[PDB]
Design a protein around this ligand. Sequence first.
Ligand code: PLP
Ligand code: PLP
Lengths: 397, 397
Amino acid sequence: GTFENITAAPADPILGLADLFRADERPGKINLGIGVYKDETGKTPVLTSVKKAEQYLLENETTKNYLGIDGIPEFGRCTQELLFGKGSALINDKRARTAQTPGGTGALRVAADFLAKNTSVKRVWVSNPSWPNHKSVFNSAGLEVREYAYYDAENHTLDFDALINSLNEAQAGDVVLFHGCCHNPTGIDPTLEQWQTLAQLSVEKGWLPLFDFAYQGFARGLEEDAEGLRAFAAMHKELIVASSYSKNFGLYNERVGACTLVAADSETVDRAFSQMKAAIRANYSNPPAHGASVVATILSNDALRAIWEQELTDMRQRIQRMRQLFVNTLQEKGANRDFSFIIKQNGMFSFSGLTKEQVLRLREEFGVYAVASGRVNVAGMTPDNMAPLCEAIVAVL
Amino acid sequence: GTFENITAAPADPILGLADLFRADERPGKINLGIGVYKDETGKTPVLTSVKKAEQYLLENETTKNYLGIDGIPEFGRCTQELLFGKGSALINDKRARTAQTPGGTGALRVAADFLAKNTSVKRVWVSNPSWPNHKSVFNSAGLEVREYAYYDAENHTLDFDALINSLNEAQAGDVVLFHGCCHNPTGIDPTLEQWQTLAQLSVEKGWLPLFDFAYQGFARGLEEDAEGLRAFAAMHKELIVASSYSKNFGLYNERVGACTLVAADSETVDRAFSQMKAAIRANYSNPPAHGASVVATILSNDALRAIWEQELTDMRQRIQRMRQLFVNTLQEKGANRDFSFIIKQNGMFSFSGLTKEQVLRLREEFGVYAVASGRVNVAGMTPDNMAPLCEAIVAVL
Ligand SMILES: Cc1ncc(COP(=O)(O)O)c(C=O)c1O
Ligand SMILES: *Cc1c(COP(=O)(O)O)cnc(C)c1O
């Protein structure tokens, strides 16, 4: 019996939490786990720009014929402009190649498979803490995962001294993974000056930087959120960018991502990109069209794009209002601590500082669901559920 | 530099051709390469049942929130009914779990990863010839791929005696891959009693059967094409099925597939399926929704399903008509080689029996593109291009 001795797998710390929430019978449940945006009414809607783009596709698609291994060309072009800028030298020098992938996760696995099978890379450095699935993706491709310091739990800030010291151990040729913006789970991003320090330190020690870009547009703005990346881009000969449209387009279940490869010249990137296309062929062959077609349609049409940029702005601003409302309401419900640091965190998540035992008690006794690390989804908070949520947090302090 | 030591990847034997075809500048070219269906006008249209389902989705979809790791539940249920039968014992005993995957390739890759990490499987046996990407998928997981004999190139028949003898060294615990129907590229499938012999020999030797089902409904019918699988399923404790809807629904670029796990009992398959979900999570996280929603919508709605089943019949019967017309026109155009074996082969592909040198001559001398193995896509033949391409073949014989 080939399957008789298999060991059951542990639950996913994010998705395993969601199945529990769906099963909970109590009517006043609150879900602050998975990073999914909710509007004021508590729903995760389809954007108007997306619905209009889908209508265009429905009435104009003539075939479902396979896309190329790397996907829709216009999709790749628009992705590189978003990442690097309209008139970037990487683009004009033809130094960058982009493959449409199934989500940001798929972009990470493609890069990992590509590295482990075509290079001498054997080590990937990931911030501590980070998105839980990072370790799983790179380990599954056969790469070793090392951790570098990032979060100061006492000051609720970025420990730039610990980060630099920890990364001194990263040898040349290693891969160092950076969150482009809206660090998951801490919400604390480097300042532009800190980015430039890392970019200079990156070229000196010979690192291959890998950028995970899942939240472009949720910190300050589309262009503003890519400053750190464009600092590395202006200084490195090689780098990898895995990006996702799941969240800034609300296209989660359509799996829309990109893996962008940068090399010193056009000849080397095409040679390396051919091996990336080979790793894709042996995985899922070619990428799903519907989600990437929507994104390409929106970014290619100035009218649709104007709607989307405005829908994304409302998302960013609503999350900022909830951060404020969250802090004020905690003080009002009797919280003794100071939660002001939540105002300075970017993106959808906040490191609340709650212990594992408190997170566990919030779930069992109050029906409030957060990840065991104390990460809470601010974008899951509404004017309606704010008061019960804060009453439960104060009760477990 | 980390990318400068990378060696360029060779051209895909199937996709490297279609790129060389889109470049060709001659009028009247004919492409008998990629395995995509075409109607009598030479186009690959969206099925009417698919447009109807897509219209229903555009109007009723309220969210794009993530699917579960294994995808749409109803999609997995309908898949098992298609494979095993409406009232199979496998389903009632709850011995089967199905994961929605990005295409048939995605299902094969998920199985390869699952087997590599969680079992002592070290070897997959694949027919010679086979779909070229089989070796790449299983190799990507580190699995050794051995080949067994299949095609009698003299009689254009299944060499069943050589098949048996060549699998003598397949050990217990080895994986043996079978094409469920419409064998790619030969179009030669085992008979029902040949299937029965293989099922009986597979259980005595202890093989783990893995069925690749990309063409259900293109040989004889939906139920008849699954008889081989169901003969195995009635005798084996364990088996794997990778199925694809890319071709029988015309959803190529939406990447709609399924990996189905079968074990001895419900507790074992659940335990093993949890590890399969872990391998999906570390690859693309969760599957794309649009294509699978279309399939689930059609198969759950009796009105849409009757339309689709008729569109599939239309596709199947056109291919069989081109097989007849191809043989007849070859005679009309003066061929002395007997091509009657074309009529006996199932699906979209057949080995024409032309040498690599003749294939090269057809391509650069008449504008007719076929794979260098001599495989031709019969679904690429139309009443308008039949006479030109037959004139071309006769010329190089
Ligand atoms: C930092 C980070 N990387 C990658 C992902 C995965 O993106 P996707 O769901 O598009 O695969 C996420 C969360 O979804 C994330 O927060
Ligand atoms: C075409 C084909 C596949 C690929 O299926 P997709 O859904 O396109 O990924 C897999 N196996 C065989 C035998 C095929 O012919």
